[PDB]
Amino acid sequence: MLNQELELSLNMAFARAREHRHEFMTVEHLLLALLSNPSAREALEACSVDLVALRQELEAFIEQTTPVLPASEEERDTQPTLSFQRVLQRAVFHVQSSGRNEVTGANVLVAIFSEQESQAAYLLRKHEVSRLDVVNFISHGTRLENFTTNLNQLARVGGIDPLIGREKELERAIQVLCRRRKNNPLLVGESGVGKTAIAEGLAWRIVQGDVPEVMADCTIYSLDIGAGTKYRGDFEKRFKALLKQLEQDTNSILFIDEIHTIIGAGAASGGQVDAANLIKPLLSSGKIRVIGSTTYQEFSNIFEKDRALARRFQKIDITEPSIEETVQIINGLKPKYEAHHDVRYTAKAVRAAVELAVKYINDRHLPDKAIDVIDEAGARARLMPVSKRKKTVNVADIESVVARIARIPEKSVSQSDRDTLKNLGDRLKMLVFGQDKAIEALTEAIKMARAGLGHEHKPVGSFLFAGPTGVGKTEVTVQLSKALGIELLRFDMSEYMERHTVSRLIGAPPGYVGFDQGGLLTDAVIKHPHAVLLLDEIEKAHPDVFNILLQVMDNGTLTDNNGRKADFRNVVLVMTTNAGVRNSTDAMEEIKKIFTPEFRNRLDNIIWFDHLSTDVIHQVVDKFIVELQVQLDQKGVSLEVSQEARNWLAEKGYDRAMGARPMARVIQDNLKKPLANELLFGSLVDGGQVTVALDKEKNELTYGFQSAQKHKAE
Ligand SMILES: Nc1ncnc2c1ncn2[C@@H]1O[C@H](COP(=O)(O)OP(=O)(O)O)[C@@H](O)[C@H]1O
Ligand SMILES: Nc1ncnc2c1ncn2[C@@H]1O[C@H](COP(=O)(O)OP(=O)(O)O)[C@@H](O)[C@H]1O
Ligand SMILES: [Mg+2]
Ligand SMILES: [Mg+2]
């Protein structure tokens, strides 16, 4: 009773149903099958139907609504719906009654129209295909500039990707826009949640006539945004001309995506908020409606408490879609992604994209991150030259995709990083002396973190460098940053005490915590994610800084503005202290008294620094002499410093209270200054020799000079 062609179309659609593993074969599956069927295809072509725009829509509906049965043991195979059988019987009854031999696809197509409540019938009516057109086919023949504006125009073609679900939110927006006062919807939600999607989706509903009667003549023009808009062009005169052009007496809605840029954040010149607040009630011969978009926090403080327009807008909470609602969203977009990637995603991969992104991609939200994993996974197939189809198993693909987004970044094996880290303790020991323990405890902690051992939610290392003044605490961290090849961010905590400096001259506390949070600390760590953060004199810092520090050491993040701006994941935090000296006896309790157990227990290590021995002080002196020798040897000048003069430099360049802090000046005043004259207009111009000695019963340095081409004669 049925054609060979139609019987094939049925079998091929039955085939797709036990591969996608559908429990139901529906009327929508039937129309989908009919797109392959020559008679139904020619009928639809006759009415000027874009087969693809119908293809994508049927496919999207089918995947969102058909139950999936890959579970276990219990009896399930594809079962046609009562409705599906009803359409075929309607087609056979009509054909037999018409005097025709067999049922063709075009006859089944006529039978679908009679399923009054079906989606298949609904789509045929949307594509403007009437039942009469198929009957007659069978019988006879045996304003703004340039950005992403005018969403109504983008909807009539195919620029806007479809909006799935969210009826309550659109309904609420339409109702808000329909009010007499406070007519302006304000979509509030996290990034990726689907705010732009709702605005764009509204423009489609206006075109489709699914927003009737008084909102038919509406057009949604989208403005340009995305935190302060004034570069060049004078914002005040272009906007005034725009709002007036939007007003000739029309029902024009203006979508301002990321509305916190113009208003709330505080601009430089006028116009901005001041001009947008103007047209909201009645300050002309007309009125405009605005759809805004912002995040939870930027609505909370900068919009509602600071107040720029808050009351005139109606807030609509746009929540993150749940797992199953996101599965429906992905299922509704899946066919267009599959067409583009030439690949098929299994229902298990779809659920996995959603569920794995929820668990592991915490920095992002719902639809957005799940859609990016799905797009990324399909693109990934191309890299295997062809694009390997994907049978019934894709979870593993999704797992690699999610793993790459969620984590990974680190090179650390058999060479470059290996040699540096294996010699880090030796490289530092050749610049900082008498503190082998400190260096060893520090490098042990770096290597450990570099081996992938440690936490991902915490800094590379959090250390408390404790010890006396001038023993190598600052020098070690400066060198640590030079040996690791990373930036050095330095902050003095004595400049971050809240109100201690006044009677002198300096005084600036509206910042401090505001200096660190608002800008400085956050800005520096965003600019240089891989760095060593040195905080001098940590004991002098205000408790607000300590809470901020307690968060860094726990969360690995710090928040000034959202999207989790400051990332301390790749930072070596170093805090130096002069607190409990290793006029105080120290063996235990001293450092413990000054810093709370809560702050101390978040440290990776309290790295202790000892006093400098007599031998160490001499090594420091030699280091200064060798640096000078390096400079002098290049100019053909040889510097020799005697033992007695080395003892004299050691004596003068080391205070027990100040450490080796006075050494640089002592070396400068006694070894560098006395050679300037001779190197410029004396015996050392063409090279030579300097001998520095000591005159004992005088305790002052002796300076001998000798010159020559090289060392010719004496
Ligand atoms: N309900 C939806 N149906 C289909 N796609 C959606 C839906 N909601 C969001 N998306 C998609 O997810 C992404 C995030 O949506 P978007 O509107 O940009 O979120 P937001 O504007 O809040 O940052 C966009 O690619 C959008 O196409
Ligand atoms: N342990 C040391 N090894 C090598 N040089 C040192 C040592 N200690 C102090 N110096 C010299 O004296 C200066 C002061 O040391 P620094 O690390 O700044 O002191 P602090 O431990 O108080 O932070 C250094 O810049 C360095 O020139
Ligand atoms: Mg200081
Ligand atoms: Mg110090």
Coordinates of C-alpha atoms in Angstrom, one line a residue, residues 416-417 420-421 424 427-428 431 446 450 476-489 527-533 570-572:
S416 CA 65.5 23.5 31.0
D417 CA 63.5 23.6 34.2
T420 CA 67.7 25.4 37.0
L421 CA 65.8 23.7 39.8
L424 CA 68.7 26.6 42.3
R427 CA 72.8 29.3 42.3
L428 CA 71.4 31.2 45.4
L431 CA 74.9 35.1 46.0
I446 CA 59.6 25.4 44.9
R450 CA 57.0 22.4 40.3
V476 CA 67.3 35.9 48.6
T477 CA 63.8 36.9 47.2
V478 CA 65.3 39.3 44.7
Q479 CA 67.6 36.6 43.6
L480 CA 64.8 33.9 43.6
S481 CA 62.9 36.0 41.1
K482 CA 66.0 36.5 38.9
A483 CA 66.8 32.8 39.0
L484 CA 63.3 31.7 38.1
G485 CA 63.0 34.3 35.4
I486 CA 59.9 35.9 36.8
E487 CA 58.8 39.5 37.8
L488 CA 59.3 40.9 41.2
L489 CA 56.4 42.7 42.8
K527 CA 49.7 42.1 34.9
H528 CA 52.3 39.6 36.1
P529 CA 50.7 36.3 37.0
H530 CA 54.0 34.5 37.2
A531 CA 55.9 36.4 40.0
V532 CA 57.5 36.6 43.4
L533 CA 55.5 38.9 45.7
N570 CA 51.6 31.2 39.9
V571 CA 52.9 33.6 42.6
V572 CA 55.6 32.9 45.2

